[PDB]
């Protein structure tokens, strides 16, 4: 009766922006990014890629409710480096790592199949 | 309680309160004593009846683990409450403590 449709966990509605950037007012150079219709996958990869950057000081995600498909990251960096640029760099490094893993896995599959 | 705790020995030898700390303490005691007063219009009879009838639902958790040490007839629990609410002219277990 009140069962929500199963495609709302990954599909944006009409006029729903995916990323909502909110500037933090408590400290300096901090931002709260709200990403809709995603889950712990992207948040875990982006946070653990952000923590390899020495220029970030705080990075943490949170899913506010399991029934709402939405997660937030708070990012606080140094005073030479925007949090949005850090989020760019984390996404780019994750893409490079995944592309390298994809080509290494294809090479390993090829040599395992041809080697017998 | 004020005189027994805010004595000139405890606030000087034990607590060692300063001046402005002492007026802050006095003002906070006065304010929170004002806040603790009962509001006029507060229904205290129904509150008393509910706060006395609510424990009566919890008067069965000590039913087990009973053997008895004295062979004295005593009514305990909710029926004893029934003997005191109803003013029973014949109690089930009348007893004098002499």
């Amino acid at each position: 009766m009140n069962a929500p449709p199963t495609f709302e966990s990954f599909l944006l509605y009409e006029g729903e922006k995916k990323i909502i950037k909110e500037l933090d007012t408590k400290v300096t150079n901090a931002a709260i990014f709200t990403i809709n219709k995603e889950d712990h996958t992207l948040g875990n990869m982006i946070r653990n890629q952000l923590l390899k950057d020495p220029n970030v000081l705080f990075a943490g995600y949170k899913v506010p409710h399991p029934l709402e498909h939405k997660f937030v990251i708070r990012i606080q960096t140094t005073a030479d480096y925007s949090p949005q640029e850090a989020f760019m760099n984390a996404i780019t490094d994750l893409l490079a790592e995944l592309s390298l893993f994809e080509e290494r896995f294809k090479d390993a599959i090829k040599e395992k199949k041809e080697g017998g | 309680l004020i005189r027994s705790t805010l004595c000139t020995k405890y606030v000087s030898e034990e607590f060692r309160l300063s001046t402005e700390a002492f007026e802050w303490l006095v003002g906070e005691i006065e304010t929170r004593f004002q806040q603790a007063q009962a509001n006029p219009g507060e229904m205290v009879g129904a509150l008393a009846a509910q706060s006395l009838g609510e424990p009566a639902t919890q008067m069965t958790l000590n039913t087990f683990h009973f053997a008895g040490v004295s062979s004295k007839n005593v009514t305990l629990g909710v029926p004893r409450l029934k003997e005191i609410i109803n003013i029973s002219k014949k109690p089930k277990a009348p007893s004098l403590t002499v």
Binding site: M45, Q84, M88, L98, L100, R104 | -
Partner: protein, 269 residues
């Protein structure tokens, strides 16, 4: 501040199972790879069932539920088909869905086993998984009933239906799950003390262990970080397991690129 250098070594590969090791990568990347193998890897499954004759002993929705869980061979097809929401079509274009038909009438006195061999397909590349089973003419196993039993019929009962199979992933519904259990394990010798054994002698050793018989735990290393992960991806027959891994990495890259595009779009404000 840069990316890792993940090294992969494959220990086993067969027609339904791959066992490999990830070296020099973070734990979030490996766990997200496991999640995208289970959930967001797309495959083909039946989604639109229409019944014209259902004189059997089971209901309409029960048969639709049993048909919808049947895995389909979708290795060469799912990367070209679009979703129904992404087509300009309305009446189920061939670049949007795959047509299946079934028409079985039992006229014999014995029990008729309606299986996946009776599920004909309009596409010559999308078949049920029992195309891998009908070619075994060396059947010393003793039984030729290697096909997924949809239903049993007695005499006088018939089943006629038309179905359309769509593209979807396991996040939407579990019938689109391509895998059948992804084993994922790091640090088998408990060298990091991520878990605490009250009696380490009471626990059986893992298959990826490096300890000998009289030892039970590795010595504690506080400097250690998780950079070696043992994966065992088992397929349910819908996709080859190497295709499961490749399409999972491709879906993760597409999601990250879409997030990057949306961030760069909102950046001009």
């Amino acid at each position: 501040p840069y990316a890792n250098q993940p090294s992969v070594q494959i220990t086993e590969l067969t027609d339904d199972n791959v066992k490999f090791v990830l070296e020099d990568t973070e734990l979030s990347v490996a766990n997200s790879l496991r999640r995208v193998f289970i959930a967001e890897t797309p495959t083909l499954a039946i989604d639109w069932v229409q019944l014209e004759a259902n004189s059997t002993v089971l209901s309409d929705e029960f048969l639709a539920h049993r048909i919808g869980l049947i895995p389909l061979i979708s290795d060469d097809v799912v990367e070209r088909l679009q979703y129904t929401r992404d087509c300009i079509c309305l009446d189920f274009c061939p670049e949007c869905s795959v047509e299946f038909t079934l028409d079985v009438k039992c006229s014999e006195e014995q029990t008729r086993h309606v299986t996946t061999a009776d599920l004909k397909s309009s596409n010559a590349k999308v078949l049920p998984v029992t195309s891998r089973n009908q070619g075994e003419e060396d059947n010393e196993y003793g039984e030729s009933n290697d096909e997924i039993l949809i239903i049993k019929l007695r005499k006088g009962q018939e089943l006629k239906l038309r179905a359309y199979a769509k593209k979807g992933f396991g996040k939407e519904h579990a019938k689109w799950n391509p895998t059948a259990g992804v084993c994922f394990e790091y640090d088998p010798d408990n060298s990091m003390r991520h878990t605490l054994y009250p009696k380490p002698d009471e626990w059986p050793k893992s298959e990826h262990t490096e300890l000998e018989d009289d030892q039970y735990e590795a010595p504690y290393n506080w400097e250690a970080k998780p950079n070696k992960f043992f994966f065992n991806v088992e397929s349910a027959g819908a996709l080859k397991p190497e295709n499961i891994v490749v399409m999972g990495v491709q879906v993760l890259k597409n999601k990250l690129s879409n997030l990057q595009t949306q961030l760069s779009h909102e950046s001009q404000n």
